[PDB]
Design a protein around this motif. Sequence first.
Motif, PDB file in Angstrom:
ATOM      1  N   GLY A 223       0.792  -1.221   0.000  1.00 21.77           N
ATOM      2  CA  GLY A 223       0.000   0.000   0.000  1.00 21.77           C
ATOM      3  C   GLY A 223       0.823   1.269   0.000  1.00 21.77           C
ATOM      4  O   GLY A 223       1.972   1.262   0.443  1.00 21.77           O
ATOM      5  N   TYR A 224       0.223   2.353  -0.500  1.00 26.34           N
ATOM      6  CA  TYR A 224       0.943   3.594  -0.764  1.00 26.34           C
ATOM      7  C   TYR A 224       0.187   4.814  -0.274  1.00 26.34           C
ATOM      8  O   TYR A 224      -1.025   4.772  -0.106  1.00 26.34           O
ATOM      9  CB  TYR A 224       1.146   3.754  -2.267  1.00 26.34           C
ATOM     10  N   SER A 225       0.902   5.920  -0.096  1.00 24.57           N
ATOM     11  CA  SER A 225       0.239   7.187   0.199  1.00 24.57           C
ATOM     12  C   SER A 225       0.990   8.341  -0.451  1.00 24.57           C
ATOM     13  O   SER A 225       1.988   8.131  -1.155  1.00 24.57           O
ATOM     14  CB  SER A 225       0.135   7.412   1.713  1.00 24.57           C
ATOM     15  N   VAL A 226       0.513   9.555  -0.198  1.00 19.80           N
ATOM     16  CA  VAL A 226       1.123  10.765  -0.735  1.00 19.80           C
ATOM     17  C   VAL A 226       1.162  11.854   0.321  1.00 19.80           C
ATOM     18  O   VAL A 226       0.435  11.782   1.328  1.00 19.80           O
ATOM     19  CB  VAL A 226       0.329  11.316  -1.943  1.00 19.80           C
ATOM     20  N   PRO A 227       2.008  12.877   0.104  1.00 18.62           N
ATOM     21  CA  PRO A 227       2.023  13.995   1.049  1.00 18.62           C
ATOM     22  C   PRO A 227       0.639  14.632   1.157  1.00 18.62           C
ATOM     23  O   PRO A 227      -0.039  14.827   0.153  1.00 18.62           O
ATOM     24  CB  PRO A 227       2.995  14.981   0.398  1.00 18.62           C
ATOM     25  N   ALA A 228       0.233  14.956   2.376  1.00 21.94           N
ATOM     26  CA  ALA A 228      -1.084  15.515   2.587  1.00 21.94           C
ATOM     27  C   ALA A 228      -1.048  16.362   3.845  1.00 21.94           C
ATOM     28  O   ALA A 228      -0.341  16.030   4.816  1.00 21.94           O
ATOM     29  CB  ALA A 228      -2.144  14.384   2.700  1.00 21.94           C
ATOM     30  N   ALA A 229      -1.781  17.472   3.806  1.00 18.55           N
ATOM     31  CA  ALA A 229      -1.893  18.370   4.945  1.00 18.55           C
ATOM     32  C   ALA A 229      -2.978  17.875   5.896  1.00 18.55           C
ATOM     33  O   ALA A 229      -3.840  17.092   5.510  1.00 18.55           O
ATOM     34  CB  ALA A 229      -2.197  19.781   4.478  1.00 18.55           C
ATOM     35  N   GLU A 230      -2.903  18.317   7.151  1.00 15.61           N
ATOM     36  CA  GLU A 230      -4.007  18.153   8.085  1.00 15.61           C
ATOM     37  C   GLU A 230      -4.362  19.544   8.585  1.00 15.61           C
ATOM     38  O   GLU A 230      -3.683  20.509   8.247  1.00 15.61           O
ATOM     39  CB  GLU A 230      -3.596  17.258   9.268  1.00 15.61           C
ATOM     40  N   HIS A 231      -5.422  19.676   9.378  1.00 13.15           N
ATOM     41  CA  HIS A 231      -5.807  21.022   9.783  1.00 13.15           C
ATOM     42  C   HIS A 231      -4.704  21.740  10.554  1.00 13.15           C
ATOM     43  O   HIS A 231      -4.527  22.946  10.391  1.00 13.15           O
ATOM     44  CB  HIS A 231      -7.127  21.062  10.546  1.00 13.15           C
ATOM     45  N   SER A 232      -3.945  21.005  11.364  1.00 14.95           N
ATOM     46  CA  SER A 232      -2.872  21.650  12.124  1.00 14.95           C
ATOM     47  C   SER A 232      -1.822  22.334  11.243  1.00 14.95           C
ATOM     48  O   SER A 232      -1.355  23.403  11.603  1.00 14.95           O
ATOM     49  CB  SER A 232      -2.205  20.699  13.126  1.00 14.95           C
ATOM     50  N   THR A 233      -1.457  21.739  10.104  1.00 17.29           N
ATOM     51  CA  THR A 233      -0.418  22.346   9.249  1.00 17.29           C
ATOM     52  C   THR A 233      -0.926  23.528   8.415  1.00 17.29           C
ATOM     53  O   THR A 233      -0.135  24.284   7.831  1.00 17.29           O
ATOM     54  CB  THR A 233       0.302  21.322   8.337  1.00 17.29           C
ATOM     55  N   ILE A 234      -2.242  23.677   8.354  1.00 20.15           N
ATOM     56  CA  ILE A 234      -2.833  24.885   7.784  1.00 20.15           C
ATOM     57  C   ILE A 234      -3.040  25.931   8.888  1.00 20.15           C
ATOM     58  O   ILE A 234      -2.583  27.084   8.783  1.00 20.15           O
ATOM     59  CB  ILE A 234      -4.191  24.590   7.087  1.00 20.15           C
ATOM     60  N   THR A 235      -3.727  25.537   9.961  1.00 20.82           N
ATOM     61  CA  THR A 235      -4.131  26.506  10.977  1.00 20.82           C
ATOM     62  C   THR A 235      -2.975  27.116  11.776  1.00 20.82           C
ATOM     63  O   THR A 235      -3.086  28.243  12.269  1.00 20.82           O
ATOM     64  CB  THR A 235      -5.180  25.923  11.942  1.00 20.82           C
ATOM     65  N   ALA A 236      -1.864  26.389  11.872  1.00 17.40           N
ATOM     66  CA  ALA A 236      -0.670  26.893  12.548  1.00 17.40           C
ATOM     67  C   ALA A 236      -0.146  28.198  11.936  1.00 17.40           C
ATOM     68  O   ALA A 236       0.556  28.952  12.605  1.00 17.40           O
ATOM     69  CB  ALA A 236       0.427  25.832  12.555  1.00 17.40           C
ATOM     70  N   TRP A 237      -0.491  28.462  10.674  1.00 17.38           N
ATOM     71  CA  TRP A 237      -0.051  29.692  10.007  1.00 17.38           C
ATOM     72  C   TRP A 237      -0.818  30.908  10.487  1.00 17.38           C
ATOM     73  O   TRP A 237      -0.415  32.047  10.248  1.00 17.38           O
ATOM     74  CB  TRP A 237      -0.185  29.558   8.487  1.00 17.38           C
ATOM     75  N   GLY A 238      -1.932  30.664  11.173  1.00 15.38           N
ATOM     76  CA  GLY A 238      -2.785  31.745  11.612  1.00 15.38           C
ATOM     77  C   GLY A 238      -3.923  31.927  10.635  1.00 15.38           C
ATOM     78  O   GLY A 238      -3.779  31.661   9.440  1.00 15.38           O
ATOM     79  N   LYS A 239      -5.060  32.387  11.144  1.00 17.26           N
ATOM     80  CA  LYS A 239      -6.269  32.454  10.338  1.00 17.26           C
ATOM     81  C   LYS A 239      -6.171  33.391   9.134  1.00 17.26           C
ATOM     82  O   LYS A 239      -6.839  33.172   8.128  1.00 17.26           O
ATOM     83  CB  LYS A 239      -7.487  32.787  11.209  1.00 17.26           C
ATOM     84  N   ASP A 240      -5.320  34.412   9.220  1.00 19.44           N
ATOM     85  CA  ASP A 240      -5.174  35.349   8.104  1.00 19.44           C
ATOM     86  C   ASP A 240      -4.180  34.853   7.057  1.00 19.44           C
ATOM     87  O   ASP A 240      -3.944  35.527   6.044  1.00 19.44           O
ATOM     88  CB  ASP A 240      -4.722  36.727   8.600  1.00 19.44           C
ATOM     89  N   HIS A 241      -3.584  33.686   7.291  1.00 21.23           N
ATOM     90  CA  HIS A 241      -2.517  33.231   6.411  1.00 21.23           C
ATOM     91  C   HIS A 241      -2.775  31.853   5.787  1.00 21.23           C
ATOM     92  O   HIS A 241      -1.842  31.117   5.482  1.00 21.23           O
ATOM     93  CB  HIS A 241      -1.181  33.257   7.153  1.00 21.23           C
TER      94      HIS A 241
END
Lengths: 471, 469
Positions: A223-241
């Motif tokens: 089995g295989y996968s690919v790079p993928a974001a989760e909410h933490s790697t988006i939200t850590a930038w801050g809501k305006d970013h």
Amino acid sequence: EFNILLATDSYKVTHYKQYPPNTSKVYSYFECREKKKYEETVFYGLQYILNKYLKGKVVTKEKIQEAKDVYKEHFQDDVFNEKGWNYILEKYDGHLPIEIKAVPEGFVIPRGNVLFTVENTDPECYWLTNWIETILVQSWYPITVATNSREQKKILAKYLLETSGNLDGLEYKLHDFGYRGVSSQETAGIGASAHLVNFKGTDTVAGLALIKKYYGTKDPVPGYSVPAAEHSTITAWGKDHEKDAFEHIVTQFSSVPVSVVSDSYDIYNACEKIWGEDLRHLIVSRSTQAPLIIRPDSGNPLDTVLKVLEILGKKFPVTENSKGYKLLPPYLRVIQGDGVDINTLQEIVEGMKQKMWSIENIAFGSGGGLLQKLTRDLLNCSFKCSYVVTNGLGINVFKDPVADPNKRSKKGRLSLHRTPAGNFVTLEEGKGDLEEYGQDLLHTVFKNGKVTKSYSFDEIRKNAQLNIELE
Amino acid sequence: EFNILLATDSYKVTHYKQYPPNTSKVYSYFECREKKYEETVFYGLQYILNKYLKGKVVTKEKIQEAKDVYKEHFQDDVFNEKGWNYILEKYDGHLPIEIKAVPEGFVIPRGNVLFTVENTDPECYWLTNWIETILVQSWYPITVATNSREQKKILAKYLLETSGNLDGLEYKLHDFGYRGVSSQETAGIGASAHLVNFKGTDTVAGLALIKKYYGTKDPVPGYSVPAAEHSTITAWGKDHEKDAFEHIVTQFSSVPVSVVSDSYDIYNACEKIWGEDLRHLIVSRSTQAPLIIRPDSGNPLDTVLKVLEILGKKFPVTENSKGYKLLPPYLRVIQGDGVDINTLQEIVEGMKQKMWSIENIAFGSGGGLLQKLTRDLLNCSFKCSYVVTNGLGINVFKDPVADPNKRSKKGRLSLHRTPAGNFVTLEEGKGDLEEYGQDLLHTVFKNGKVTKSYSFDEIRKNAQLNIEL
Ligand SMILES: O=C(Nc1cccnc1)c1ccc2c(c1)ncn2CC1CCN(C(=O)c2ccccc2)CC1
Ligand SMILES: O=C(Nc1cccnc1)c1ccc2c(c1)ncn2CC1CCN(C(=O)c2ccccc2)CC1
């Protein structure tokens, strides 16, 4: 360390005092009982159990004493069969005098058929057959995950073929997201391996090691996968970013497929304005081998998928394939990984079809729905005694509760055969011995402490193929 | 052997590359998010900390194994070899993480912080959410323990109403779930969680788990009794059911014994075999050694009611001080088929309506107790609420436009008692303002060591029902 003497339902400790005296054989079988839809089941997972728990020297003096000590307190009474367990230790060097015969793993068999049988090979161990019911019945889980995963593959295949003319990418259309949503690490590995009978996409890493150890594949991994974001790697930038987070991530993974969860604040804004305008230039430049996969993760699953496609279809160049369905450009795809189970999967692909969107555009991720929201009742996985020998005479035995004919069990010695039309039939009452139905499809897989026949994961996958794939 | 580098969701392998550059801290928390099941029993984190997270969990061999797997799994080299090597070299493979948690057994309303996780070394900002997957599996023992306790509340209410006391409550819901769960490991975990509330189990795996990770003053946390299954009845042959019954109750003549009685005809078994042919062997038994008749098929409520009416006509029934009917003390019933929290409620209410005391009955539950549960039931969820990037702390959260129920909490969190004695979770570091007293979370894990733990006896005390208190 695992102790088979402590791996049964407590009451079974007391059954050696309950069988008819002078009983030399107890013969039992497992089926996915028919119920007056899941009409066929994938047999998978027994080989794991045989190797991990049942084979070799599974009885020691220390294990017998530990069980004796536990049960004395657990029952407030001395009921434990120490003599019976000592006999296995002394006579068989702690190897179980049991024979198990089973249909080959990966085989797809209609409900109501014998899948495996268990019997003692030494008259002294008549009690042992049903001692191991509890551990063997847990095969319900990989059977049910494999079966339910395969039923979802059938739905995906049907709609993918209808909307695109082929089945390209089918084996990546349902991705296992269930690692956090199952009840244990062991369950995660078993369940993930069962899903991989049908698909190649998984984030449940535990599945890989299980397959490598107990089954084996020609390929390095199953089995295989690919790079993928989760909410933490988006939200850590801050809501305006949010835009900066997206840009950073697709730039980091510019040459491989990348999945980016896009509903942290407003999925529709993210699709229309961020991906569709602000960062459009970083998407349309991507290779066909490295698309952006946009991932909604909230809202009504069908409503949200359709609205996401509608938005993207207006910001990106859409084509119409040869079947008349709309197709996003090859650098852009969608994965729906929230609220997916067999029912909602069907709803989503049907809704897409109605709105003229090809199933080529979408993949699904499923977690709890795939690996946790399943029980032994779904396929009525059940283990029952059908034959005993008492005073040297064989007796065909069974239950048949007056208020539930669905719980009637089979009688006597069983065997599984091909019918003249090429279907399956289970013969009862030792009728397989008449030899009117060709060879018994059950094979000895375990005998007296040794695993006697094994299957690779490649063979299992071959056996579990869909008809549509075969065609 | 378990390898924590291979015990996360695949995609998290790639996350160290996705956080803002110069992020030194990622702080996350677990809650049973608010939307039935208004309060949850916090249970099971201690098992996870001890079995999987504490001590030297990183080795050179484990790093190499993970590297090799991920290279094939992603068809690319994306694995953070350097990050993991740093932990191995600097901390002898002990995780530089701090976890704070509410005490095990605590009963807490939905939507409160239950535990928090943060890295203690700036280099290991990525480690907090690496272990999300492992820690989130605490949903399972939490949910089993909670659903088990909700059933205990139902049983308590009806037993109290029909008998005037709670005698035997702790034996009224028996774990039959060993065969119906998804693995041996799950069996032990789920069985242990049920034993937070009750003392009756056939899932033997629960006992060793409790003994190893929690501990009890008593030799064992749970108990069972001799009981038949269909094979020990049917093996006698269809015309010899009476002989099977007679043999079994004579073998277990001075301890309680449960005998499944529906192999062919539950109503005949009760009225003619138990009620007539073998009656003399039942009415002679001790109060400490009753026959427990076990139906196992049919509509659960209708079957219980008919079994009770049958037995009530063949055996001497009394009327207790509350006006409800009671079988003689050598005879009881256990319904072990089709029992979940919903049908349990229906059965006890139906018994009450027919004036049968709940003293007469016990329940067994298997899949309903240990398997038919998901992370969605209590919305068990782990989210990042605070990060430090370029030396600046930021309060972070998700808030999806189409589902306000998925909004997460912001900033540094703490748990407090309100002026009325309830729980409140303060966000945005507001606990530091000291307007709400001390944080009720305790540090339970720090830098590879378990720093606070609870015995199973204390967990049980924390989990008691109000009516018991
Ligand atoms: O977020 C992810 N996983 C995850 C794990 C645990 C909890 N939440 C999420 C995750 C994992 C694997 C993913 C993913 C997203 N998005 C795509 N993949 C793997 C595959 C990549 C290749 N695929 C496509 O290119 C493709 C996608 C959609 C339609 C047609 C084709 C199909 C899926
Ligand atoms: O059949 C049994 N277990 C089992 C396990 C796995 C799969 N199927 C069945 C089984 C297990 C434990 C049992 C049982 C029956 N019948 C009673 N117990 C344990 C306890 C024995 C003592 N108890 C009573 O005397 C009692 C029973 C009913 C009302 C009031 C009191 C309460 C229940």
